[PDB]
Design an enzyme around this catalytic site. Structure first.
Site, PDB file in Angstrom:
ATOM      1  CB  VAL A   1      35.754  44.016  48.425  1.00 60.58           C
ATOM      2  CG1 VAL A   1      34.969  43.343  49.510  1.00 60.58           C
ATOM      3  CG2 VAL A   1      35.653  43.217  47.130  1.00 60.58           C
TER       4      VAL A   1
ATOM      5  CD  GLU B   1      49.909  46.576  53.588  1.00 59.41           C
ATOM      6  OE1 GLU B   1      48.842  46.047  53.225  1.00 59.41           O
ATOM      7  OE2 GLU B   1      51.020  46.286  53.105  1.00 59.41           O
TER       8      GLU B   1
ATOM      9  CE  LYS C   1      40.741  37.624  33.480  1.00 58.27           C
ATOM     10  NZ  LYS C   1      41.116  39.033  33.140  1.00 58.27           N
TER      11      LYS C   1
HETATM   12  C1  COA Z   1      44.481  39.763  44.731  1.00 53.11           C
HETATM   13  C2  COA Z   1      44.102  41.177  44.246  1.00 53.11           C
HETATM   14  C3  COA Z   1      44.709  41.477  42.886  1.00 53.11           C
HETATM   15  C4  COA Z   1      42.573  41.334  44.117  1.00 53.11           C
HETATM   16  O1  COA Z   1      42.177  42.626  43.904  1.00 53.11           O
HETATM   17  P1  COA Z   1      40.649  42.942  44.025  1.00 53.11           P
HETATM   18  O2  COA Z   1      40.427  44.387  43.610  1.00 53.11           O
HETATM   19  O3  COA Z   1      40.180  42.721  45.434  1.00 53.11           O
HETATM   20  O4  COA Z   1      39.961  41.872  43.120  1.00 53.11           O
HETATM   21  P2  COA Z   1      39.176  42.119  41.784  1.00 53.11           P
HETATM   22  O5  COA Z   1      37.955  41.217  41.847  1.00 53.11           O
HETATM   23  O6  COA Z   1      38.773  43.565  41.577  1.00 53.11           O
HETATM   24  O7  COA Z   1      40.103  41.662  40.567  1.00 53.11           O
HETATM   25  C5  COA Z   1      41.387  42.254  40.345  1.00 53.11           C
HETATM   26  C6  COA Z   1      42.191  41.708  39.234  1.00 53.11           C
HETATM   27  O8  COA Z   1      42.566  40.373  39.503  1.00 53.11           O
HETATM   28  C7  COA Z   1      41.950  39.549  38.571  1.00 53.11           C
HETATM   29  N1  COA Z   1      41.512  38.349  39.205  1.00 53.11           N
HETATM   30  C8  COA Z   1      40.945  38.248  40.411  1.00 53.11           C
HETATM   31  N2  COA Z   1      40.704  36.947  40.652  1.00 53.11           N
HETATM   32  C9  COA Z   1      41.136  36.237  39.592  1.00 53.11           C
HETATM   33  C10 COA Z   1      41.145  34.882  39.302  1.00 53.11           C
HETATM   34  N3  COA Z   1      40.593  33.977  40.282  1.00 53.11           N
HETATM   35  N4  COA Z   1      41.650  34.453  38.129  1.00 53.11           N
HETATM   36  C11 COA Z   1      42.144  35.335  37.250  1.00 53.11           C
HETATM   37  N5  COA Z   1      42.157  36.650  37.498  1.00 53.11           N
HETATM   38  C12 COA Z   1      41.662  37.126  38.665  1.00 53.11           C
HETATM   39  C13 COA Z   1      40.830  40.357  38.006  1.00 53.11           C
HETATM   40  O9  COA Z   1      40.535  39.938  36.722  1.00 53.11           O
HETATM   41  C14 COA Z   1      41.406  41.650  38.002  1.00 53.11           C
HETATM   42  O10 COA Z   1      42.382  41.751  36.972  1.00 53.11           O
HETATM   43  P3  COA Z   1      42.079  42.286  35.476  1.00 53.11           P
HETATM   44  O11 COA Z   1      42.006  43.791  35.506  1.00 53.11           O
HETATM   45  O12 COA Z   1      43.222  41.842  34.572  1.00 53.11           O
HETATM   46  O13 COA Z   1      40.765  41.712  34.958  1.00 53.11           O
HETATM   47  C15 COA Z   1      44.572  42.206  45.262  1.00 53.11           C
HETATM   48  O14 COA Z   1      43.913  42.022  46.501  1.00 53.11           O
HETATM   49  C16 COA Z   1      46.062  42.140  45.510  1.00 53.11           C
HETATM   50  O15 COA Z   1      46.869  42.614  44.693  1.00 53.11           O
HETATM   51  N6  COA Z   1      46.524  41.483  46.722  1.00 53.11           N
HETATM   52  C17 COA Z   1      47.952  41.429  46.963  1.00 53.11           C
HETATM   53  C18 COA Z   1      48.507  42.538  47.835  1.00 53.11           C
HETATM   54  C19 COA Z   1      47.688  42.740  49.093  1.00 53.11           C
HETATM   55  O16 COA Z   1      46.814  41.944  49.386  1.00 53.11           O
HETATM   56  N7  COA Z   1      47.989  43.888  49.921  1.00 53.11           N
HETATM   57  C20 COA Z   1      47.252  44.197  51.165  1.00 53.11           C
HETATM   58  C21 COA Z   1      46.594  45.574  51.202  1.00 53.11           C
HETATM   59  S1  COA Z   1      46.192  46.345  49.632  1.00 53.11           S
END
Ligand code: COA
Ligand code: COA
Ligand code: CL
Ligand code: CL
Ligand code: CL
Ligand code: CL
Lengths: 504, 504
Positions: free
Chosen positions: B272, B293, B407
Site C-alpha cells: 500500500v 522512520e 488470507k
Molecule cells: C500490520 C502489518 C504487518 C501489515 O503489513 P502490510 O504489508 O501493510 O499488510 P499485508 O496486507 O501485506 O499483510 C502482511 C502480513 O500480515 C498478515 N495479515 C494482515 N492482516 C491480517 C489479518 N487481519 N489476519 C491475519 N493475518 C493478517 C498477512 O497475511 C501477511 O502475513 P503472511 O505473509 O503470513 O500472509 C505491518 O503494517 C506492520 O508490521 N505494522 C507494525 C509496525 C509499523 O506499523 N511500523 C510503522 C512504519 S513501517
C-alpha cells in the site's frame, strides 16, 4: 466588592438566565471546567431549566458540549437531567450524564485531554459558537482571570464566535497570579512552537486569559461553589498499595535509578491515586515536585507538609472541605502552585522532557498488563481516559494502582483479558495492588503474566488466573501472548450472568 | 580508499570469528540496524556457528539481542537458526526469529521504537556488555560513520562495556555526511534537553557516532550487502486504497484544512505504501516533505522529480533497484536526505510540533476503530508495534490502511472486537480499505462503527458485522461501546478451529 476591575465591560452584565438565551439549539459550546473545578455554574443551571420547558413544548434544544474535563452537578448534571446534550467530550464524572452516555442518549468521545485543544482548532468538533468561561475577576485591561482551573479556556475563547464570562465571587481573589497562560502556538496550525518549559516550576506566560472584548456577549456575576466528591479516607487496601509503592521508590533510589527527590510527579484522578499521595506526605522523599493534571487533596497535603515544594497542574480537584482549607490559606498555597493550560500540563513533549513519574488508577488489567481505565464489561463508560494516556506513554515510569478486587470481591481487577484496552503493555511498567507490586520492566508478555499473577492478584482469583494461563500456554494459537479465546472474556460474562466472577 | 582513517584503531582489526569470541553466554548485545539496513553481518554469522557448535556439545550459549528495529538474515536469521537468542527487543521481521518468538523459545517485547534508547539507558534490558555496530568508515579523529541507518547505535555505543565495529566496504563511502547525530540529551537522565527541531530538514548535530576508542575491542573488515524483503508492486487493492487516500488529501486541501504541500509525511512500508507514494508523485500536490522512520523507493522518486523537497528518517528501506539508483547518485540524494537517531526520528515532541501525517498498516480494527498491528488471533506475533504508536498518537492526522480482508477472504480485517489492541480509538482518526474511507473525526464509538462498517468493511462480512452491532446495541451491558462478550472473539475462534471467519 467589584470583581470586574474593567469599567467599560461592566456594561455587558446581564442575568444568568438572559445570558443562557445566547446559547441556541445545535450550538457547539466550549466551557471552562477541569474536573470539579472552574466550570460555569449559573448559566448552565438556567439553560437546563430553559431546555426542559422547550422539550415539553416540543421544541428541539440540545448542544454539543466540549470542556476541559469533568465539570459538576451545576453543568453536566443539570444539562443531563434536562436531556440537553447531544455530544459530549472529553471527560465526565457526573452520574446523570454518565447515565445518558451509557443509554446511548448523549454521544461521547473521551479524547486524550492534552489533545482536545488541538483537535478543536482542527475543527473536529465543528465550529465553536459559544465559549462559556468562569472567572475570578476581570482586570482593568480586560484580561480574564481564571479560577480553580485553566483547562481549555484560552483555546475556546480564541475559537468561539461569542463569549460568556461568569465572574464568581466564591473564588478566592488571591487566585490572581496563580495561573500561567502562554501566548505561543501549542495547539494551533503546524509548525507549532517549542514550549520552553525545562522545569516544572517554570512560568513562561501571563496571569490572564486573553479575548477580544468585542466577542464578549455577556458577563454573569455568581457566588457558587465548585462541587466535587470527597475522597475516601485511605483504608487498609489503599494504605497497603501506598506502602508497596513507597518501598519501590526507595529501592529505586538505593539502586541509583531515581534521585532521592524522585522526579516530577503526576497523580491521576480518583481515590487510590489520592491515597498514595497521603503516603508520600510523610514519606522519606523530600523536595518533591508535581507536574500533574490535577492537584487532589493528597497533593495539597504534600505541599502542606512541605514534602513537595511546588505543584504544576491544570486544576485543583479538591473535596468540598479541602476547598475550604485552601481558601482560608490561599496566601500560603498561592506560591506553591502553578495552573497551566491543559494542552501544556498534558504535553507529551514536556512530560517526557521532565521525566515524569505517572501514577494512575484503573478499572482492571489483564494478566499481560494491558489496562482498562474506562469501560466496565467493555461497554459501560465510567469517567473517561482523561490524561492517563498522555502521561502513561510519555512518562519515565508508568505506574498503575488498584485494589485487586472490586464490588466486595465479586470482581477481579486482574482478568484473563481486559474487556477494553486504554493502555497497552508498552505503556504500563509497574502495577500495585494491596497484594503486592509487579515490576514488568524488560519482560516479555509471558514473563509479565507470571509477575502480575504472582504479585498482584487476589488469592481468591490467583488459582483461576494460573489455570487460564497454564492452559493458554499449552493450547493457544500462538505462544507469544497465549490466550484461550473461548474463555478470555468469560469472567466478564460470568459477572453479567450471575453477579460474580467467582465460579459456582 | 582506506575506510579506517584513524591509524591507532587500525591495530584493533581482527577476524570476524575472533571478534565473535568476545561475546559470551548471557551477554546483552546492542546492535546497529534498522529494518533491513545497516545491521552487523559477519560477526553475527560467526557467532551463530559457535553457538550451534556449543549447543551440539550440550553447552548453553545465548544472548539478549537489542537492536534499532528489524535486522536481516545475517543477524536475526542466523542467530534464530542457532537458537542463540534468549531475549529480543524491539522489532523483528525475520521469519526464523518470528518462529522462535511464537514458539516461546525466544522472549520478546516490542517497545515503541522512539523509546528504546531511553529504556536501555534506564537499565530495563540490563547492563550492555557489547555494542556491535556497522560502519561506513572511521574518521581521522576516531568518529564512526554509520551506514544505511542510524537506529540506536549512538546509545548502544555509550552504554556498552566493549565495542565491536564492522567496517563494511559494500556501503557507499558517500554516505558520510548524510547522518545527523546529536550529542544532546534525548534519551538520557532527566531533565532532558529540548530537541530544537522546528523543520524537517534541520540538522542539529554531526556526521559521526562518538565512542571512547579505549572501549573498542575489535574491528572487522567486512563486505556484505543489506538484505531487505523484495519490492512488492501495487496490486489492484493497493491502488484502490491509495486512490481513496489521495482523494481525501485532495479534499482536505480544497477545504483549506491542509496546505497544498500537505504536512510532513510518515509512511510505513508495504504494498500500500508504494501505491500511496506513487499517487503522491502524480497527485495535485507540491513541495512535499517526509518526516518518517524509513526512506522507500517512492520517496527517492519524488526527491528525484522535485515533488518531495527533503526526507528525514532513521534508515533506508530500498529495493535492490532503488539501492542501485542511489548507490550511483549518492552525491545528489545525500543533499535531499537526513538520517537521524531513531529516538529523534520517532520523538513524539517533534512529530507533534511538525504536525506529521501518519500512515500505517494494520492487522485488523474492530468496529469501534481500535487497531491491532501485531498479534494475529491475539497471540501470534507478526513483526511488532514499531514506531506506529510513536507516530499515531503524536500526529496531526492518524490514518490506518489495510485490505478489508486477509488470507484470500477467509479473514475479515474489520472484526467485532480486535483480538489484541495496539492503537486505541483515540489514536486513529482515518481508516482506508479498498472498499472506501472512514473519517472518524469528532465521532463517538457508535458513530465510528456506523462509518467503519459502511465504508471500510468487506461486503461479504458487512451483514455479519451489522448483525453483531445491532444485537449488541440491544443487549450490551452498557450502550456506550456495545458488545456481546459471548460473541466478541468468536470470529477469531472460528478461524482457529476452521480456517475461516465465515460460518455457512
Ligand atoms: C500490520 C502489518 C504487518 C501489515 O503489513 P502490510 O504489508 O501493510 O499488510 P499485508 O496486507 O501485506 O499483510 C502482511 C502480513 O500480515 C498478515 N495479515 C494482515 N492482516 C491480517 C489479518 N487481519 N489476519 C491475519 N493475518 C493478517 C498477512 O497475511 C501477511 O502475513 P503472511 O505473509 O503470513 O500472509 C505491518 O503494517 C506492520 O508490521 N505494522 C507494525 C509496525 C509499523 O506499523 N511500523 C510503522 C512504519 S513501517
Ligand atoms: C479508573 C477509576 C474509575 C478508578 O478510580 P479509583 O477511585 O482509583 O477506584 P476505586 O477503587 O475507588 O473504585 C471506583 C469505582 O470504580 C468501580 N470499579 C473499580 N474497578 C472496577 C472493576 N474492575 N469493575 C467494576 N467496577 C470497578 C468501583 O466499583 C467504584 O465504584 P463504586 O464505589 O460505585 O462501587 C479512575 O481512576 C478513573 O476515572 N480513571 C479514568 C480517568 C483517568 O485515568 N485519570 C488519570 C489521569 S487524571
Ligand atoms: Cl515543546
Ligand atoms: Cl521495558
Ligand atoms: Cl523537545
Ligand atoms: Cl476527534
Amino acid at each position: 466588592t467589584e470583581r470586574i476591575r474593567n469599567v467599560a465591560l461592566r456594561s455587558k452584565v446581564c442575568p444568568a438566565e438572559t445570558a443562557s438565551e445566547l446559547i441556541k439549539h445545535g450550538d457547539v459550546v466550549g466551557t471552562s471546567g477541569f474536573t470539579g473545578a472552574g466550570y460555569p455554574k449559573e448559566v448552565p443551571k438556567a439553560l437546563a431549566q430553559r431546555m426542559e420547558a422547550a422539550h415539553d413544548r416540543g421544541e428541539k434544544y440540545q448542544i454539543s458540549l466540549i470542556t476541559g474535563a469533568a465539570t459538576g452537578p451545576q453543568l453536566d448534571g443539570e444539562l443531563a437531567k434536562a436531556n440537553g446534550v447531544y455530544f459530549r467530550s472529553p471527560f465526565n464524572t457526573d452520574a446523570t450524564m454518565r447515565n445518558r452516555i451509557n443509554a446511548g442518549e448523549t454521544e461521547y468521545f473521551d479524547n486524550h485531554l492534552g489533545q482536545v485543544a488541538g483537535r478543536a482548532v482542527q475543527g473536529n468538533y465543528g465550529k465553536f459558537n459559544i465559549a462559556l468561561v468562569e472567572a475570578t475577576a476581570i482586570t482593568e485591561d480586560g484580561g480574564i482571570v481564571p479560577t480553580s482551573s485553566v483547562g481549555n479556556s484560552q483555546t475556546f475563547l480564541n475559537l468561539a464566535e461569542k463569549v460568556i464570562i461568569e465572574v464568581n465571587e466564591w473564588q478566592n481573589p488571591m487566585l490572581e497570579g496563580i495561573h500561567d497562560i502562554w501566548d505561543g502556538n501549542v495547539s494551533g496550525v503546524p509548525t507549532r512552537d517549542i514550549v520552553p518549559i525545562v522545569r516544572a516550576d517554570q512560568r513562561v506566560g501571563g496571569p490572564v486569559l486573553r479575548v477580544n472584548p468585542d466577542k464578549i456577549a455577556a458577563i454573569v456575576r455568581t457566588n457558587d461553589r465548585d462541587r466535587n466528591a470527597p475522597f475516601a479516607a485511605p483504608d487498609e487496601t489503599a494504605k497497603a498499595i501506598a506502602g508497596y509503592l513507597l518501598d519501590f521508590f526507595g529501592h529505586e533510589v538505593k539502586q541509583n535509578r531515581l534521585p532521592p527527590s524522585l522526579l516530577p510527579l503526576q497523580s491521576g484522578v480518583g481515590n487510590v491515586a489520592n491515597a498514595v499521595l497521603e503516603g508520600l506526605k510523610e514519606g522519606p522523599f523530600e523536595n518533591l515536585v508535581g507536574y500533574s493534571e490535577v492537584i487532589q487533596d493528597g497533593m495539597l497535603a504534600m505541599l502542606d507538609s512541605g514534602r513537595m515544594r511546588i505543584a504544576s497542574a491544570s486544576s485543583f480537584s479538591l473535596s468540598p472541605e479541602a476547598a475550604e482549607e485552601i481558601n482560608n490559606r490561599m496566601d500560603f498555597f498561592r506560591s506553591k502552585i502553578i495552573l497551566r493550560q491543559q494542552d501544556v500540563s498534558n504535553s507529551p513533549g514536556i512530560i517526557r522532557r521532565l521525566g515524569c513519574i505517572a501514577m494512575n488508577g484503573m478499572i482492571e488489567a489483564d494478566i499481560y498488563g494491558n489496562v482498562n481505565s474506562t469501560r466496565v464489561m467493555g461497554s459501560k463508560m465510567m469517567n473517561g481516559i482523561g490524561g492517563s494516556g498522555d502521561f502513561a506513554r510519555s512518562s519515565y515510569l508508568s505506574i498503575f494502582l488498584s485494589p485487586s478486587t472490586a464490588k466486595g470481591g465479586k470482581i477481579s481487577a486482574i482478568v484473563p483479558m481486559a474487556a477494553h484496552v486504554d493502555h497497552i503493555m508498552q505503556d504500563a511498567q509497574i502495577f500495585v495492588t494491596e497484594q503486592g507490586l509487579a515490576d514488568l520492566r524488560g519482560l516479555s508478555p509471558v514473563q509479565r503474566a507470571r509477575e502480575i499473577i504472582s504479585k498482584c492478584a487476589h488469592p481468591d482469583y490467583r488459582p483461576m488466573l494460573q489455570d487460564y494461563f497454564d492452559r493458554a500456554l499449552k493450547n493457544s494459537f500462538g505462544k507469544h501472548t497465549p490466550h484461550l479465546l473461548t474463555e478470555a472474556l468469560s469472567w466478564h460474562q460470568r459477572f453479567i450472568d450471575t453477579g460474580t466472577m467467582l465460579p459456582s
